[PDB]
From Swiss-Prot:
Residues 3-6 are annotated as: Important for RNA-binding. The modification N6-acetyllysine is found at residue 207. Residues 1-435 are lumenal. A motif (DEAH box) lies at residues 103-106. The record marks 274, 277 as: Involved in NS3 ATPase and RTPase activities. It is found in: Host cytoplasm; Host endoplasmic reticulum membrane. ATP binds at residues 12-19. This is Serine protease NS3. Residues 1-155 form the Helicase ATP-binding domain. Changing residue 207 to R: Diminished RNA-unwinding capabilities. It is a peripheral membrane protein.
Amino acid sequence: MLKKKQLTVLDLHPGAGKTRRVLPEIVREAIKKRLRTVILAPTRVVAAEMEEALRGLPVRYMTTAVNVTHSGTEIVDLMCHATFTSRLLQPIRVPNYNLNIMDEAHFTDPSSIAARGYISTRVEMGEAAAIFMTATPPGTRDAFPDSNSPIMDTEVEVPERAWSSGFDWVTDHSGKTVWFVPSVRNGNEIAACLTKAGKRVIQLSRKTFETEFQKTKNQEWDFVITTDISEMGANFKADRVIDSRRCLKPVILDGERVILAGPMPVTHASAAQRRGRIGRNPNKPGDEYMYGGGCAETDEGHAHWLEARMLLDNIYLQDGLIASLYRPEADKVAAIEGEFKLRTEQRKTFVELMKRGDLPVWLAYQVASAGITYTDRRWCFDGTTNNTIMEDSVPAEVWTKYGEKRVLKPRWMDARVCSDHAALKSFKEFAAGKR
Ligand SMILES: Cn1cc(C(N)=O)c(C(F)F)n1
């Protein structure tokens, strides 16, 4: 695996020990061979788990999720996917790693797709080796891969709203269930229904995942309601998955706005990862997977792949060369390489709108490319009428940095800024000049 110009897809089935058994073997070998190595975790939670698997090996943890005193001498770095791409974007020197290891390498967030693109391009250039660890590489068509123990698969109608009758099987179960919903809002409704029926429910989503995931260890629970973020290496001591088989797809319409389309079917890779939360313990056969729809290749035209191009157009590789997306996932977007390359000052604005601004990549790009500076929030208020953001069926309002109450009506409307209460709260703070 370790030879220059090699990219290896380590596609052992879910729970086959890629992270806890194989990875430390790869790391030991890398250190013996004096290969400057990076290890890329999808989440802080995974980073912390990796620390436990690698304990006693000389690894620099470039994350506050791990409390360790480094020697200074480590030639192996560990950071999150997002942190890697973030450092590439910024005017900070990122070592040209000889070996690049991506765990949970199916992650479809823009920064992860961009990271794969950059790393695979380095490998194709002859510069580096890489190892992508995932049970579900890009374009997999198998939603039902092998497991540590047999799984009972059943196609069944799964509720997506509060119910009073007709789904007794949901609540009659005495074990622990992980339930994949397509959005925070939808999970909130199902969670409230389960709570009303006497169940203990934890909810997980991107923004809450570190904090809330700990509750799954510290408290007793009957249900975990989660979005697709729990596809990325989240482990639960569960005996059932309920899978709506549904997700939201950000879609750019007319180059002009972003909508959250669907809910619509998940990919085969996502379904397999959802399912792969269970069947993990060879001493507990008969874990259940209840699934409420089919799969489809809904990554096609999904905005994350275009956003990944926006990231990659703005990462230095060599002169004017631009990294390509990783070949198996490169046709998911119709983009011209370099179309999104920004001049130095607009690039810095772009970066800052993502990093400090916490805006979606697409939105950050619209603002930066328009020649707007990071602190200039006039664009949050001067959109067309149909860009009015609504909060409880009334237009959302903030007090501007000038102290004037105005309706939130962004010049570029990206649905992700108001997909749930928390998101809209954050966008309100942004529009007000509060970060
Ligand atoms: C990516 N790449 C750039 C060069 C070069 N230095 O101009 C070469 C090699 F064939 F010399 N590969």
